Symmetry: D3
Subunit: 245 residues, 6 copies
């Protein structure tokens, strides 16, 4: 089975019957695709395509990335699953695939990151630049993002060159994972597993946010945060202990 894919295809078929004028959109992006992988790469290439660099070139490059990284099949699905499990506003597997710029931005970064590591720096920067303009997510291609990442609303996200985000993290819009100013080498946050980072929060410097911690909306976080705590405020203070899942 591939239950995420089969659900997505059933939803697209229903969506098309319900609203025929969207048939070109839904067949080109889901129903004529032979796999979820090709559906996701297609949508993102179409959103990022421009006269400067066609959707085709983007999609063909994405194909080469998938070929080199079969593990992306798994990561992709855990990422879709993170949306489904963590966002009450949408009730379909199809929604992140078609609609959610946060989800698109994560996979775009995975592409840009892979290119950057191949020494295809320009392609990597081009995708960073286009993602920054169209998804409003400025993620440096050398950043490292884990799987099961949930990028909710996303607008205004900034992630620096040396930032690391571990698995099962949720990140709101307006979040900066950035540097302080005395910044040469390793200068951006390391975000551990199961963290939630609320809207507008700034996490600055080579500091750590410990496992399962929550950063309240609007915090400015300048010192490392221990595991299992809630921080809030400008500057941030521990305001509680917290759990995971």
């Amino acid at each position: 089975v591939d239950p995420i894919w089969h659900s997505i295809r059933a939803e697209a078929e229903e969506a098309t019957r319900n609203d025929p004028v969207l048939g070109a959109f839904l067949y080109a992006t889901i129903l004529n695709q032979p796999s979820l992988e090709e559906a996701v790469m297609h949508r993102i290439a179409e959103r990022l395509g421009h006269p400067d660099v066609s959707a085709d070139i983007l999609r063909q490059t994405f194909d080469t990335m998938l070929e080199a990284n079969p593990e992306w099949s798994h990561v992709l699905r855990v990422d879709i699953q993170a949306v489904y499990d963590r966002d009450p506003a949408y009730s379909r597997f199809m929604d992140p695939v078609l609609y959610l710029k946060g989800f698109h931005a994560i996979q775009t970064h995975r592409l840009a990151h892979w290119l950057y590591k191949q020494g295809r720096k320009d392609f990597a920067y081009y995708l960073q630049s286009r993602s920054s303009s169209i998804f409003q997510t400025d993620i440096h291609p050398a950043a490292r993002l884990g799987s099961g990442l949930f990028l909710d609303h996303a607008t205004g996200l900034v992630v620096g060159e040396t930032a690391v985000v571990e698995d099962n993290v949720s990140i709101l819009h307006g979040v900066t994972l950035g540097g302080t100013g005395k910044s040469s080498g390793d200068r951006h946050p390391k975000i551990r597993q199961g963290v939630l980072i609320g809207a507008g929060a700034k996490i600055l410097g080579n500091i750590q946010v410990g496992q399962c911690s929550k950063i309240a909306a609007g915090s400015v976080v300048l010192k490392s945060v221990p595991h299992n705590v809630t921080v809030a405020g400008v500057p941030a203070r521990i305001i509680g202990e917290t759990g995971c899942t």
Copy 2:
């Protein structure tokens, strides 16, 4: 009479004489249009059009919404009037129509909201997604927005599924009307009449901001705000009493 429309047409004619290369823009969007309604729907369809879903399809759908909601004629004009009366930076009725993504985003939501209520969920999400990418306004289609809404600068606005904004409200860029985390059902703010919400403010949870209240730039608002007060800070505190108009 229709003084907003007649002023807009006189401005466009003058603008065209003054700068002929913009004649195609100004005739296609204003001067060849038989009404303000068709001018507004045209501009917004053109800004939102994409290979995925043409400007035409968007404009035709907008036409069906107007046909089903003749009250939008009135709402549209009070919305234009809110810009004219509340923003010193522009002195023309034409400016919101042509230029102001906040104004475009409000009417886009009105379209998406109507579609959502018709059971055209995908179209609704598609427009939410496109508005989030192009206008940087992420408004859930189930949100409810009153008339005489002023969306100034707009970039980064987020409005949740169960948020309600009442009439004659002004909202700056960077504003979140969102949820806290213990969020099942009704979980997003209710904004009463005549409120001003300043840049970067986050209003979180199923809480109310009372009539004529002001939220200072950068506030994190976690508790309901009574009528006629100014709140400021992280977290927000009452810092004064205030009036309307």
Copy 3:
């Protein structure tokens, strides 16, 4: 010599050999151009072009601006130099030219500002509107920006009509240079030389930020800031003395 230009051409040639599919991008924008000026105006016109107003019309208008302002040759280069000297994340003169929406937004404003002063108000607003949508930078065309301006990440920048930014300033994303509310005439900040303004900061009213001062990420600045100090917090407080360069 023109060492910035010659370095940019050598980088583009190398980039093209390294990744041939980007040859159309890199030749159209750099290598077939006879000057850095024409390269910069071309990239920005291509990013801002739309069915509403073609990249060609934008580029031709840009040409007229350069012809009227030969000083832009110098300003452009000091602006590129500000990126090179102040951002560790990129190591090429070519990077701002091709990729950095902040850099594109600054020159876009310089164009819009010049048009505004010519009485080509609509063109000016059109470019403000398009820059606000594509670069997420909302800069009123009557704003005044000095040279050696560094707009890092840029997303969500708002600059009001009467704001003045002097030379050698660095500005992060999420920054508002805006008004308080009792705002008739001169109502927006004046930013002096060598200032750094951190992510998310709001500077509100006709107040001054003195030379070489630093505004920490997330500050709400409501009172004028003296020279050579660091301010932080909501509301902002002096937290230190600081220097320039």
Copy 4:
């Protein structure tokens, strides 16, 4: 229940478009945006043609808005386009649907594009008219001077390579194939292109040259070069053309 509520051409086209969408849903954007969302056949035809001619140089929208202006000034276009559609339906065995010319056949799209251009030209909007002529020549391969006069119930079958000069006149119920020139001898000044009478068929690749008349109900065989006026009710063939027989109308 006024007489103009009778419109079997539009209703069949709406039914055919919906059935097409069910059977091939990927075509739904095309068929809804061009037919099913339109409140009239006039608006569907204007939209189709506008989209075919649309270019970064002059948008489909500007073309469609200009078409709207033409219809408002020329109400008879509603009947003319219906008779032109009926011509295809009656005269071409290769297509079974009223929808076929509306969506597909560049001859039908060229005819209405000329009607638009012709109106614009008479209004003193000569650049708009030449622009349409230019775009029609490039996309429909039909180079029709905007001063040319074309009747109704015109069937432009296949159409590729059609040239019609400035002073040509084509009357009602004519059928014209691809590769046809209604042109000049090259040796006169004013009135200098052909006058085609009602009911004429002009075969593929025919050149008709000069201020000459093709008489009513006559037929021009494929590849004829026609240099002298043709009487009514004959077939001509050959290079140059000669009467090869007698013919009737309908």
Copy 5:
């Protein structure tokens, strides 16, 4: 090292495309996206053709995905397109490369577009088929009815102005020039367009009209009008056409 690993046509095309890019790097986006990034000649041809026919009305993507469906259902298309490419290579002195038809020659693009349309038409997808016919008529200037039957090793040289009727049959190894009509007399109902046998050459501007046969290995001189069946192994010329001599194949 199965037999179908032998593919000198694809390998030469890959080499020619890479050499072209080195020599003229601004063409790198075109040549990589159309040839060098593709894992097969089939995918390059589908991509090229999809991009040429693509329009806001129906995207290149939808066309390319539909092409993919045709290849999956018609595996023989892999050999057919290779023989069609080999026809150009063998029969046109003006071009030296297998890559020339794949990228440039609208006759070759039209042939495969017809193959797609023909398959769709037989599947009951008649709107898709007419849409392709319509788009091919406008962009390649080749108006080929989707019910027409076209053999392999077809060379459509220059192509502009080609018209092929609904009941036409063209067999293998035919060469057809621009301005050619395989059409009707206008006076019959069912089977009514030409049957072209193997090895035939049809010269520029020829009209072949009626349910008539052009016999094997025969040649139709430029500008001929052909109204009667042509026996094998002759050349015909003239208006109307007459046997002017004897001819062999190859």
Copy 6:
């Protein structure tokens, strides 16, 4: 006040474009971006042609930048394009303005596109050249081999269906109509296409086939098939062509 400051063609075009905009302001984007914002006629012509040929496959910009390179290497193009414009103005009654070929007439756009392609081909940039030939065939319906040689003061009237072979030569002051082939007999190897001398007029649909010469000032009637060299100062007509009379130049 050097001699090359005299440019009545450019100045009339600038005046005509501005007057057009006042009269029909919706055309302002087109006319300003193509004429009024340009600092030279060369730049207007390059821009117009680049925009017509532009495609996602190779942008108008790349085409315009490549045109710029051609002009820089071939300064005589400034005079050639002006004589080509003057040819239309002098030879076509249907248009009254120097601006008409620059904006509208695909024959004029094809000629300059060939000039670009021809230069590229001689530079070893054969893919670029074939790409332009391919795009011109599809958008202007003029299939001109880049190795063909075309003189100045060429008038390509209507143009649809033009085919010119690899070894064709056309000298100065020629007028050529639509449906014209300067092609091959199909039976030779090297030099194999026509040599057209100065002052020739070639009528619509004419096929001129072989390494044959059309003598100076001669005229080819519409629909002629020309298989033998034509002496100077005659008119030929027919299938095949025969001398039908005597003719002079101008």
